[PDB]
Design a protein around this nucleic acid. Sequence first.
RNA 1: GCGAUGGCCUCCGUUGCCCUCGGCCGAUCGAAAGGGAGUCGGGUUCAGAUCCCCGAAUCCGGAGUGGCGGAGAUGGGCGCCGCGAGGCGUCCAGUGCGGUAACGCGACCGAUCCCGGAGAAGCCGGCGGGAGCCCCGGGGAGAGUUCUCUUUUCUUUGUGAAGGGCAGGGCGCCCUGGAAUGGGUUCGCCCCGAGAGAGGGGCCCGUGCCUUGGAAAGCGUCGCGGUUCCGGCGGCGUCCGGUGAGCUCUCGCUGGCCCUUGAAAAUCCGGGGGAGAGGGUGUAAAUCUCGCGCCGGGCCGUACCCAUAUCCGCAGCAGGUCUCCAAGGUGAACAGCCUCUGGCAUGUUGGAACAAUGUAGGUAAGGGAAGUCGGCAAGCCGGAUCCGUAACUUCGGGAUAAGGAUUGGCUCUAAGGGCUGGGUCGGUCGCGGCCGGCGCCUAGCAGCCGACUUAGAACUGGUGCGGACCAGGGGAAUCCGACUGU
RNA 2: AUGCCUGGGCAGGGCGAAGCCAGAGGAAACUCUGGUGGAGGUCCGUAGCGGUCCUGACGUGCAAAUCGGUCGUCCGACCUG
Lengths: 50, 91, 114, 99, 69
Amino acid sequence: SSHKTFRIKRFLAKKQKQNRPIPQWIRMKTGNKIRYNSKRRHWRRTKLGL
Amino acid sequence: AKRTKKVGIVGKYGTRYGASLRKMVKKIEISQHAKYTCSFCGKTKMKRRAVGIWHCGSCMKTVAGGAWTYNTTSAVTVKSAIRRLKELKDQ
Amino acid sequence: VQRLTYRRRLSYNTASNKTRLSRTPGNRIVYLYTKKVGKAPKSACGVCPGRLRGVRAVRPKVLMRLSKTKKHVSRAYGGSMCAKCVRDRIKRAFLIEEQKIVVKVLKAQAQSQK
Amino acid sequence: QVLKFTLDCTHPVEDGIMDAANFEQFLQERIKVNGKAGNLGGGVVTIERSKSKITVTSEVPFSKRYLKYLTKKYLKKNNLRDWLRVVANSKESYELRYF
Amino acid sequence: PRKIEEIKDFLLTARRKDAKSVKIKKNKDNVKFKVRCSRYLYTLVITDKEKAEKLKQSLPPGLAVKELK
RNA sequence: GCGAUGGCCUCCGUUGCCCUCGGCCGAUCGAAAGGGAGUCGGGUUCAGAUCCCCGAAUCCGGAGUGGCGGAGAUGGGCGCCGCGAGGCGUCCAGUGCGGUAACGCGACCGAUCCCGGAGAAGCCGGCGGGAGCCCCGGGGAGAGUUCUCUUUUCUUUGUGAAGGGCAGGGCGCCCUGGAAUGGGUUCGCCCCGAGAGAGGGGCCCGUGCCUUGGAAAGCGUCGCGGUUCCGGCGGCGUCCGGUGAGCUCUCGCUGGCCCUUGAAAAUCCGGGGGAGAGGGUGUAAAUCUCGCGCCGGGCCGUACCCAUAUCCGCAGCAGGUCUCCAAGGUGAACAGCCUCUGGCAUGUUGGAACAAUGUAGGUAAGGGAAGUCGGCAAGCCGGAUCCGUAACUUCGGGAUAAGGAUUGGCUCUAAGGGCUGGGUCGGUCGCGGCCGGCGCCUAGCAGCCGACUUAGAACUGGUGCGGACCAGGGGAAUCCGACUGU
RNA sequence: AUGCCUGGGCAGGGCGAAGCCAGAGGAAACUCUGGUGGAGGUCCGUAGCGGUCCUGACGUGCAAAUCGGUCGUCCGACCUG
Ligand SMILES: [Zn+2]
Ligand SMILES: [Zn+2]
């Protein structure tokens, strides 16, 4: 919106940082049942209804 | 009667609002828009600024009078009666 | 023909968003945001429609930056009342004081007679 | 006022492409004064030849780019608008240069 | 900026403690001396050329009088 | 006024107490389009730059010791010395000055208190000033055409904020003077013995022109240094004029409308007063600070899309979503059509044929609503100029009623305007200036410029001419609802 | 849906009301003619707003109400953030 508040900007920054995929070496752990992030959000859909 | 026969100022309303209503309005419409003679300067500058308030262009005097006329007959009568009562009381 | 855009984020054409055209040394027409037109102070009499002379018509917060001589005129009630009403006040005050003196003298004479 | 305009062609003729006499004849034929092409509008404009430099001297007001237009027309007629171009070397001067 | 009509006033302006680089611009009969100060850039326009040449030697402290070209 | 510490306990600051003074009007929140001091130009990144670099400014706060100059400022009288300029002693005044006036000059003491102004104002019409853009006549620079012509057509042809000065507007500002034989004046209005015309002045905006900025930079060209990096180096130009109910923005007057009267507060300033301060004759208190000089301005957003793909509709959905900039031609026009700057690949695919049904356009001999519940649909008229226009009526309308003629091209004619110019002869001074009687164009003429129209005439095209586009079908009546509006 | 506050916007044309000017007639009252003026919950009409008709297109659509032509209004009981 280019006129965001500090709290909104910090929330958006955290949601942007959480969007990165899983490191490859994670799957090499012994008790690993994780294949993909399954929580990635694209800007087009699942509009993060703030 | 150069252009209009018996409408004049109410010719702007056209055929609308009824002939009798326009005829009744004509008197007030002329009276409120007519400039009177200010009895402070003697000039024809008394113009109706708003409802019941008239202003002199030259004197810059504002007078509280009638809604469509500068002086109403009721105002004249009450002023005369008040003056008579004042004179009777003071002697 | 060079079409130009607003240089700020206030896209709506409001009183605070008034602009004017200006040509730069780069040979391109741009927008300059002009200040509001200030008005000279009006006479304290309240009867004269005209505004006072000899004083700059600028914004009140620019009156702070303006010097003292620009904000008034060297006269009694200077920069606050017109000269016509000032002299009318002077002569009215003198005449009313003279009339009060005359009334006082007449009252004293009446008391002496009675 | 004296208006002197030069059309110096230093080396289109040194290579043997055009002829200064033919250029002068074309200019004398085609120079138009007050809507009159022939006779150079009387004794007003004069043309001098130096086997490389063509000098047009005029008394009445005279456009300098008119000479450029005439030179371009002459080069087009002689099929020379392919390796030649008219350059304003200096004020009141023109030069024919290659690409 | 402020234009100065007097060479003496220009010298007084250039003699300030806060004064700094004073550049000289030869503008083809419009030669100027521009002295930079804390608040204003004071300009002096000299029509004469010999007068400007003489004024070139009037800088007291060995300033940054380096010309513009 | 008292008490105390602190710092050259000189001088100042601080807090504690006492005396004294004091209206406000409700704490607080409430607008990234209301009010709100102050930044512009050039350059720059793969992506941010009124923010970064350079160059010019400006606002607010601080400034104790006050860092400087300048204003309060260096007057008069008396008695002496000295030819003289001048010097000494003593009495003093000195919070500025000028103009009849509007008012002006860089300052030019001032409190509690009080008054006022700005902030702070609706809609619409007309006119005038300025700017941006468009137009025309030319100079240049670069350029398309040149099978024929075209002094060719196309692009460019500049200066910031902040100061100084001058054009140009407005004044309900002042002075001399008193006018009917009424005058002045606008597109209209309007003004005048409560002071009009005519002269001399004063103030406000001056966003426009010149100047510092500023040509150093930018742009258009011609030519080089450099294998390469390279924000380089240089020659020139960036010029002279006229215009228009022309479009947009802004400013200023003038009006019309309201049983509509068209916002508050923060903040700033001016004025009435002298409560109080000053040094005493060379200095001082004060500078609503006059010109400079020093320091600081903290926190948050700053990318992009803003919409036939970045928002909401389950989506790259023919839907919806608040604004600014607005070229040329035709044209009444911001109508439709064509073109320039800019944008794009025809809108979730292409190829081959052109069967029937369709969707969207058209055309049809003769009849012209005979089809159908019903002229449903389509079609007809359509712009402008010139004639003409009934019944009825609330006298305003009906009305573009109805009904007629013209419309192209080319060549001419007539009409509707601005600026300048005669003070010519003699005398005199340096073609220019002054004086005297002359001509006084007082029926105006002579020269120079410029935007469009209106009417008429002839000729002519295969009767075609609002040739595309834009673009009313009318008349006679009945019922209902006054109407506009929802 | 409505009330309030604070902002924005609405080409080009027709009709030509009050008011004013000049001429003519009159003994007066005043009346006719030619102009100026631009008022109107005025008319044609663009943007905007709304949705009459074709009961057109589509009707497992572009769309859980859209598109084309034709439409009413467009200075005020107007539209809108
Ligand atoms: Zn009066
Ligand atoms: Zn007054």
